[PDB]
Amino acid sequence: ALPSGSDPAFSQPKSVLDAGLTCQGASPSSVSKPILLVPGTGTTGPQSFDSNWIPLSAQLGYTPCWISPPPFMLNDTQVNTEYMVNAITTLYAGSGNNKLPVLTASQGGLVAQWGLTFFPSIRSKVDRLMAFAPLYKGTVLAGPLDALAVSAPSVWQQTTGSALTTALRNAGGLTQIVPTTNLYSATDEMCQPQVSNSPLDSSYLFNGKNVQAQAVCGPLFVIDHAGSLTSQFSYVVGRSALRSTTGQARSADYGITDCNPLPANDLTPEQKVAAAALLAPAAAAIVAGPKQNCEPDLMPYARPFAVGKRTCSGIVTP
């Protein structure tokens, strides 16, 4: 079974977590049809989504909301998840005690699934998860010892083999917990392996709607980790997932004629140009942020699932 019982303690003051949550044109505490947007490593909410799912979800009738855990999602993924759990608790009540969708970019999907695995209270408040290029198994690429002996906390945790990805898998987290759609690409340049269109892929969750773009669009279709979020093909799949009465994208709703890798048609020209410039700023933030030579310790609620892995304090024990 999954973790059950009481939610783990928060390490951050609630006022700090509240400060990281914003909704466009509304208060999180009094908001119609919120969608919670969870950014990837090296970005804020607006930086991840201003060129894409903030305007696109608004045009579908949601109030776009986001968390921006400081600094730029570079801190410990477990602390980033506190922002999401707090945001879910708030948006659920602030929308009349109604479940809400969560939509994530890159490592924001790891944040979401970590929260669902280890914070039982939110499972009944999230109606579906729409994850673009999620790194549930981390990635084998680049890495925390590349070009400097120190790397950001969440960069350590997103590395395949990390104590965090280990603990997520051993606790049951590579199976979907709420209805989940995972849109990803075999040509993802941040996250590998993604090529097999099978559970080997880092974005795959058992029983989820796992959509590798090349399985629909052809072996030669190319979108990177950002295009995975912003492309017109991505918009059609995400719109399906958000509208579906099953909580997952439906194969009937998308097909080879939607295989357009450029930014979603309904974005403004300015939004389309910004959608093409997402790589460099996130990479530079990763370079300028907090850095360390070890993976953050697992919090007690996750330690028993990665016994034997090495974190800053030493060997994980249960």
Descriptive account of the structure:
The protein has 318 residues and is an alpha/beta fold. The protein has one domain (1-318): Rossmann fold. 31% of the residues lie in helices and 12% in strands. The protein is built from twelve helices and nine strands. It has helices at 14-19, 45-49, 53-59, 77-94, 107-118, 153-157, 163-170, 213-217, 227-230, 232-243, 269-275, 279-288; strands spanning 21-23, 34-38, 63-67, 100-105, 126-132, 180-184, 209-212, 310-311, 314-315. The strands form two sheets. The chain has a seven-stranded mixed sheet, with helices on both faces. It has a two-stranded antiparallel sheet with strand order 8-9. Strand 8 (310-311) and strand 9 (314-315) form a beta hairpin. Helix 4 (77-94) crosses helix 5. The longest helix is centred in the first third of the chain and has 18 residues, at 77-94. The radius of gyration is 18 Å and the shape is globular. The two termini are 18 Å apart. It is an enzyme of class 3 (hydrolase). It comes from Pseudozyma antarctica (Yeast). GO terms for molecular function: triacylglycerol lipase activity. Disulfide bonds join 23-65, 217-259, 294-312. This is Lipase B.
